[PDB]
Amino acid sequence: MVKIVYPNAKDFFSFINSITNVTDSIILNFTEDGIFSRHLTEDKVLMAIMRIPKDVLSEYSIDSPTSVKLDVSSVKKILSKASSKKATIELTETDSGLKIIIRDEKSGAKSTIYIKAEKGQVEQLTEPKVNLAVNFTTDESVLNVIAADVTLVGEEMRISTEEDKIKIEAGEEGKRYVAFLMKDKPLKELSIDTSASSSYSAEMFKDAVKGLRGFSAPTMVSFGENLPMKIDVEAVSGGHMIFWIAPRL
Amino acid sequence: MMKAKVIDAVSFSYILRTVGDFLSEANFIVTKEGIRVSGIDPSRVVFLDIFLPSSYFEGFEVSQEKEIIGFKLEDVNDILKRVLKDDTLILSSNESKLTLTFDGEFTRSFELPLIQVESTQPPNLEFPFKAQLLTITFADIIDELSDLGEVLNIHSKENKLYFEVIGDLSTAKVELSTDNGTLLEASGADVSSSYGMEYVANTTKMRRASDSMELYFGSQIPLKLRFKLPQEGYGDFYIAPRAD
Amino acid sequence: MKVVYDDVRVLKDIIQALARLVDEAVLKFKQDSVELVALDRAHISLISVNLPREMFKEYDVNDEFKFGFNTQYLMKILKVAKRKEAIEIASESPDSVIINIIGSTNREFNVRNLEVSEQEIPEINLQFDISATISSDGFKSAISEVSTVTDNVVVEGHEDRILIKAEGESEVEVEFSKDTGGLQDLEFSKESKNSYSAEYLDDVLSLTKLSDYVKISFGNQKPLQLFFNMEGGGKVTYLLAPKV
Numbered sequence: 001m002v003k004i005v006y007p008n009a010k011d012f013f014s015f016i017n018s019i020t021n022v023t024d025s026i027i028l029n030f031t032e033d034g035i036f037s038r039h040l041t042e043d044k045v046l047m048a049i050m051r052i053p054k055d056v057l058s059e060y061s062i063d064s065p066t067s068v069k070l071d072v073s074s075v076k077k078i079l080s081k082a083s084s085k086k087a088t089i090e091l092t093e094t095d096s097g098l099k100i101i102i103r104d105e106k107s108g109a110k111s112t113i114y115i116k117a118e119k120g121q122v123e124q125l126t127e128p129k130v131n132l133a134v135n136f137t138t139d140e141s142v143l144n145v146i147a148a149d150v151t152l153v154g155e156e157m158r159i160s161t162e163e164d165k166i167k168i169e170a171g172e173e174g175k176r177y178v179a180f181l182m183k184d185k186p187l188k189e190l191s192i193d194t195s196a197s198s199s200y201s202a203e204m205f206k207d208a209v210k211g212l213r214g215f216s217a218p219t220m221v222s223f224g225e226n227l228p229m230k231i232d233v234e235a236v237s238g239g240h241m242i243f244w245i246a247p248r249l
Numbered sequence: 250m251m252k253a254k255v256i257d258a259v260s261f262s263y264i265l266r267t268v269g270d271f272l273s274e275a276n277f278i279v280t281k282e283g284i285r286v287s288g289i290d291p292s293r294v295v296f297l298d299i300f301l302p303s304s305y306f307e308g309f310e311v312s313q314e315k316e317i318i319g320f321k322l323e324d325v326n327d328i329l330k331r332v333l334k335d336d337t338l339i340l341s342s343n344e345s346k347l348t349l350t351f352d353g354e355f356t357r358s359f360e361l362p363l364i365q366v367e368s369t370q371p372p373n374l375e376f377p378f379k380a381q382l383l384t385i386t387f388a389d390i391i392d393e394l395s396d397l398g399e400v401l402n403i404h405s406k407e408n409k410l411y412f413e414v415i416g417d418l419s420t421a422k423v424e425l426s427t428d429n430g431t432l433l434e435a436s437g438a439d440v441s442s443s444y445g446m447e448y449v450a451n452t453t454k455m456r457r458a459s460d461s462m463e464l465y466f467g468s469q470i471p472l473k474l475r476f477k478l479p480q481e482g483y484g485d486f487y488i489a490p491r492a493d
Numbered sequence: 494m495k496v497v498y499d500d501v502r503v504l505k506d507i508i509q510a511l512a513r514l515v516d517e518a519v520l521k522f523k524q525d526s527v528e529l530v531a532l533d534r535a536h537i538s539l540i541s542v543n544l545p546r547e548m549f550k551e552y553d554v555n556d557e558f559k560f561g562f563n564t565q566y567l568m569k570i571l572k573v574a575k576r577k578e579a580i581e582i583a584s585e586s587p588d589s590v591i592i593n594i595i596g597s598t599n600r601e602f603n604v605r606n607l608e609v610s611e612q613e614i615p616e617i618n619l620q621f622d623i624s625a626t627i628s629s630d631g632f633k634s635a636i637s638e639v640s641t642v643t644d645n646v647v648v649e650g651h652e653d654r655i656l657i658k659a660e661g662e663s664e665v666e667v668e669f670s671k672d673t674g675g676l677q678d679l680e681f682s683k684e685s686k687n688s689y690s691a692e693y694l695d696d697v698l699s700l701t702k703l704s705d706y707v708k709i710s711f712g713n714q715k716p717l718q719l720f721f722n723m724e725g726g727g728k729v730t731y732l733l734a735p736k737v
């Protein structure tokens with residue numbers, strides 16, 4: 001038996017949907033610690049990590065750890081409409097692959113989706129070992145405003161520290177963009193260890209933050225001097241959605 | 250070098266969105282009394298005239314007697330579509346750049362290089378009929394009718410205003426009067442005219458920047474729509490009548 | 494004749510389905526009720542509507558009046574109303590129908606009456622192997638989910654559950670049973686299974702807004718019946734032939 005039950009189908013689908021902004025071929029890893037999925041874009045610039053620990057899970061049964069290789073290109077439409085905040089989500093291994101079971105408490109509907117899937121050896125979860133000197137907390141809505149602003153103006157986003165302020169720049173010709181984020185305007189939290197500055201792909205930042213729209217919890221963003229950007233959110237129902245963005249240069 | 254701050258950035262953005270339906274490029278004409286935008290559409294049926302008095306702005310400063318700031322409506326509107334619910338807006342300029350700065354949640358600033366836009370202004374007019382009404386009443390009715398035909402028929406009868414769309418196996422009609430409460434004031438002769446529905450329907454976004462409006466028309470003379478903005482601002486739209 | 498109904502929204506939900514099914518239809522105003530029976534354009538399904546006079550605010554119909562209309566056109570009229578505003582349908586002349594959308598402003602539509610040829614469909618009583626009553630919202634969700642992956646909605650009936658299914662490249666099954674509490678009522682005679690067009694089921698999904706529950710009836714080699722019992726005595730039935 002490989003079997004997990006997550007308390008909130010809507011939160012769970014937000015994870016699946018985030019990972020989908022990178023690929024439609026998802027690999028779910030059922031480990032001794034819970035479930036995770038990690039995928040990179042073709043250029044290796046954007047990394048998406050879904051990490052759901054077994055303690056936030058309402059049911060858990062993983063006799064032998066496995067990876068499961070799924071194309072969700074066609075089933076994600078169903079998952080999208082069937083996932084209600086009032087529904088629970090079950091993922092169970094079958095001989096042919098996986099079965100997703102959604103139990104709607106409101107409509108009393110039980111939606112079962114069978115997916116063919118290859119089984120593999122469970123891969124490992126490693127994140128970069130870096131010290132990111134700069135920290136701030138905001139919400140999804142702020143990050144999505146910024147993303148839409150920068151992508152309109154250019155293809156590169158420069159983020160830097162300017163004395164108790166985070167500065168964001170874009171545009172590489174006539175049209176420019178500048179934004180300033182500070183404590184309480186709108187930052188929930190801000191920690192500037194040492195002056196730091198970095199540049200990232202605007203498209204990649206937009207794809208990273210576009211997934212966070214399903215999460216209302218505080219979002220943490222960390223970066224360093226010519227280092228990756230980490231974007232981290234904890235779902236209300238448990239688990240983390242994490243994005244790493246490789247720096248330019 | 251100028252600087253003008255609008256507190257209600259959202260409403261301001263809907264004025265420019267409306268202008269964008271008629272024009273590709275325009276000039277902000279900036280003087281000590283405020284900002285003016287005028288233009289004629291490609292089909293030459295509509296002339297528009299927007300005036301935002303200095304007092305319309307929270308802050309207003311100019312360095313020149315007359316500053317002309319040319320812009321592409323699509324580009325200015327792409328930026329204005331980025332506006333947040335409670336943002337204030339600061340328009341500022343120099344020789345090369347137009348800057349739009351949103352402020353509220355946080356501070357965000359966009360720069361557009363100026364472009365060279367050929368200037369505009371065409372032909373004071375007597376109208377035999379004038380109506381006054383809430384902009385939302387006008388907007389609702391015109392949105393509803395705009396899907397029903399290509400021509401809007403307007404006529405007055407004993408100080409009553411009628412909007413008509415004559416279709417296939419149907420005819421749509423609305424009666425606007427002071428008695429049924431849809432008009433605030435109406436006065437003038439019994440006249441009749443028709444106008445392009447597309448042009449009239451384009452002005453309906455002014456509902457977000459205007460509470461009150463004035464309507465003037467006559468037989469074979471333009472439809473004038475004046476949308477009253479705060480502090481004596483206006484958005485005027487003159488629409489030529491369809492050949493009789 | 495003259496009728497006044499206070500929720501044009503309910504009428505809109507019915508005509509929407511009807512407009513997805515057939516070009517022209519007839520609203521038959523009789524002494525006790527307004528009736529509508531229509532075969533879709535391809536003759537594979539039947540839509541039936543009964544609206545008892547009790548649900549109308551005003552009902553002056555002394556003899557049968559036939560309102561023949563273009564379904565797409567009437568759909569345009571019913572959409573000029575947004576929230577809870579009333580609709581008036583009147584007619585002095587048999588060739589002309591007056592529709593009034595009553596609200597902030599009164600919208601008046603003068604419609605030419607259409608001579609739609611009808612086939613006085615026989616009042617057949619059908620024997621179903623199963624009748625299951627589930628939430629209308631649940632039904633819509635199940636149909637929406639299954640339709641994304643198939644054109645063949647397989648419906649399956651047992652003594653304790655009804656199932657809505659896709660069988661093919663993507664296997665999906667939505668269950669409403671005893672233990673899920675999704676089953677409000679069930680009349681069981683025989684174990685049933687049949688497939689129906691997803692396209693035609695999608696055409697009528699607006700009907701799921703008329704009632705809290707839908708009674709679903711079918712059998713092996715039997716057609717699919719959807720019954721919507723509305724809270725005014727109103728009755729809507731959709732009957733759909735087996736696929737292909």
Ligand SMILES: [Br-]
Pocket residue numbers: 030031032033065122
């Ligand atoms: Br493991």
Ligand SMILES: [Br-]
Pocket residue numbers: 051052053239240
């Ligand atoms: Br975790």
Ligand SMILES: [Br-]
Pocket residue numbers: 076077080
């Ligand atoms: Br989706």
Ligand SMILES: [Br-]
Pocket residue numbers: 106107108628629630631
């Ligand atoms: Br429900």
Ligand SMILES: [Br-]
Pocket residue numbers: 129
């Ligand atoms: Br290490």
Ligand SMILES: [Br-]
Pocket residue numbers: 017018021210211
């Ligand atoms: Br997304």
Ligand SMILES: [Br-]
Pocket residue numbers: 214215216217234235236237
């Ligand atoms: Br969340």
Ligand SMILES: [Br-]
Pocket residue numbers: 266269270322323326
């Ligand atoms: Br535009």
Ligand SMILES: [Br-]
Pocket residue numbers: 343345346
């Ligand atoms: Br500059």
Ligand SMILES: [Br-]
Pocket residue numbers: 275276278287367368369370
């Ligand atoms: Br000009």
Ligand SMILES: [Br-]
Pocket residue numbers: 373374375473
């Ligand atoms: Br004038």
Ligand SMILES: [Br-]
Pocket residue numbers: 375376377467
């Ligand atoms: Br005159």
Ligand SMILES: [Br-]
Pocket residue numbers: 294444445490491
């Ligand atoms: Br014209």
Ligand SMILES: [Br-]
Pocket residue numbers: 453454456457
């Ligand atoms: Br609008």
Ligand SMILES: [Br-]
Pocket residue numbers: 470471488489490
């Ligand atoms: Br003219």
Ligand SMILES: [Br-]
Pocket residue numbers: 522523524525555556557
């Ligand atoms: Br009768």
